[PDB]
Amino acid sequence: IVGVGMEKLIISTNEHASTDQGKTVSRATTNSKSTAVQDSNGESWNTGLSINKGESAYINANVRYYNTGTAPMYKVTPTTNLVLDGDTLSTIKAQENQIGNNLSPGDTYPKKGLSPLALNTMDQFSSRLIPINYDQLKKLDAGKQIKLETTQVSGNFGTKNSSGQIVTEGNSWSDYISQIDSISASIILDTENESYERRVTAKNLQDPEDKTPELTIGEAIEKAFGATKKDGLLYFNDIPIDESCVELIFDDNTANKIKDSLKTLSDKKIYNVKLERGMNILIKTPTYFTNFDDYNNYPSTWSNVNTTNQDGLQGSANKLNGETKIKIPMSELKPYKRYVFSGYSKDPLTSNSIIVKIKAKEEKTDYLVPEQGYTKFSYEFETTEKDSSNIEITLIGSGTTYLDNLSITELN
């Protein structure tokens, strides 16, 4: 899975400027019917500016290539758009100057610690620059930015010939892209400092001759990301990636399929739902998460700490009639992000609701009515300036309610 990201753009205004300078000396003599001698001196200066309205400026973009799949790509040749407002200025396929020889999974071209590569030619032989109009130049000078979108990437894979030598010429991933996309479901794990994208084969139930093995979403996730099982839950390396410890984002079709499958399912867990072709599953691990058993990353601490009750989703509840207070110092939160606070709540007996108060940029107070089982609420908040006041979360409530698996997750 290869993509391109642009670091910065450079504009080269195409103008012609000239200056002139001169001096003159004259001499005249008049004879009337008398005489008169006139001596003349002079000097001059000039400036000029010429501009072409067709090609007023040239643009140069510095880009990087990243890989998030499971295989390397050879002779990486991406294709990109350059879009200003709603206009695609140009689409360029990478030439020999912009081709990456190797790109291992999790690596970057150019490698980390090197400057980005310059894409500044658009013809096949790297002999012509990328122009823009006078109007596009005016838009650029007005403060509008150019975005870069990658449409496709070409690359090779390695095999072995009749001898032990590795061959990459003639082996193209485009011959397998459509075939892989057609029979697979796509799963993404987001983490915090690296992203992973996978494709897992799914079974078609309408074809009786399709003998591919069946899988659930949990088994597919474990096989795709190499997760380990400790006590029936999944850990990627150390982060728990169980469905109750992370945030799951689906597309509409996948959400409808999971909804239809849940009502007929026994355990009624998403990880027990059968995997199907065309699914788009995205896993987003939280920034801070506590389960009241072994995992806690909050820079602050919760006011109410009582884990002596063997209740909750996984053997811990840590909640009573008291009030829970957390004070996020705002020094660990990104300036401009759309954060989300989530958790699970349950009332064994029907009692009063809980006052959910969030004060990050504005004070928000909302109420939720827990059921006899556990449900998640997932309120939202947003950071302000990376240097402003702290973040305050208060969970005022009574009726000895119960909580578990509180998380803070960011997103776009």
Partner 1 sequence: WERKEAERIEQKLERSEKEALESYKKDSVEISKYSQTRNYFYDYQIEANSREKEYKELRNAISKNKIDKPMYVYYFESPEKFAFNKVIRTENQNEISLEKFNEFKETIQNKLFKQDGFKDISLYEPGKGDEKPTPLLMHLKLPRNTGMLPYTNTNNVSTLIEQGYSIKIDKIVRIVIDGKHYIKAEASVVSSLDFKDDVSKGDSWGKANYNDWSNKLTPNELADVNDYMRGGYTAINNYLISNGPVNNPNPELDSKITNIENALKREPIPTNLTVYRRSGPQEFGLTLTSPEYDFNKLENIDAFKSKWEGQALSYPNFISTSIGSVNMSAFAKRKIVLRITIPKGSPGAYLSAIPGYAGEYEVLLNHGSKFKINKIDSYKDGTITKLIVDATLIP
Residue numbering of the annotated binding site for Ca(2+):
291, 293, 314, 316, 404
Q: Which does 46 bind (CB under 5 to 8 A by kind): its own copies, partner 1, Ca ion, none?
A: its own copies
> Which residue number, 53 or 160, has a Cβ lying nearer to partner 1?
160
Nearest residue to 109 (alpha-carbon basis) of 149, 82, 60, 75: 75
Annotated binding site: 291, 293, 314, 316, 404
> Which residue number, 97 or 297, has a Cβ lying nearer to its own copies?
97
CA dist., res. 34 & res. 213, Å (int): 121
Binding residue for its own copies, selected from 30, 193, 264, 308, defined by CB under 8 A: 30
Residue 298 token pair = 């909050």
Q: Which does 201 bind (CB under 5 to 8 A by kind): partner 1, its own copies, Ca ion, none?
A: none
Q: Which does 162 bind (CB under 5 to 8 A by kind): partner 1, Ca ion, its own copies, none?
A: partner 1
Q: Which does 312 bind (CB under 5 to 8 A by kind): Ca ion, its own copies, partner 1, none?
A: Ca ion
Cis check: omega of the bond before 110, within 30 degrees of 0: yes
> Which residue number, 120 or 318, has a Cβ lying nearer to its own copies?
120
Distances (CA, A) of 189 to 64, 199, 221, 230, 239: 21, 12, 9, 19, 11
In three-state secondary structure terms, 100 is strand
Least distance to partner 1, CB of residue 236, Å: 43
CA dist., res. 288 & res. 334, Å (int): 13
Q: Which of residues 160-179 bind partner 1 (CB under 8 A)?
A: 161-163, 165, 167, 170
Q: Does 183 bind partner 1 (CB under 8 A)?
A: no
> Could you tell me the sign of the dihedral formed by the alpha carbons of 227, 281, 403, 359, in that order?
positive
Binding residue for its own copies, selected from 143, 162, 178, 208, defined by CB under 8 A: 178
Least distance to Ca ion, CB of residue 411, Å: 24
Q: Which of residues 55-74 bind its own copies (CB under 8 A)?
A: 57-58, 60, 62, 72, 74
Residue 51 token pair = 């501009």
Burial class (CB in 10 A: 0-12, 13-18, 19+), 277: middle
User: Strands 196-201 and 100-103, how do they pair?
Assistant: unpaired
What residue ranges bind partner 1 (CB under 8 A)? 159, 161-163, 165, 167, 170
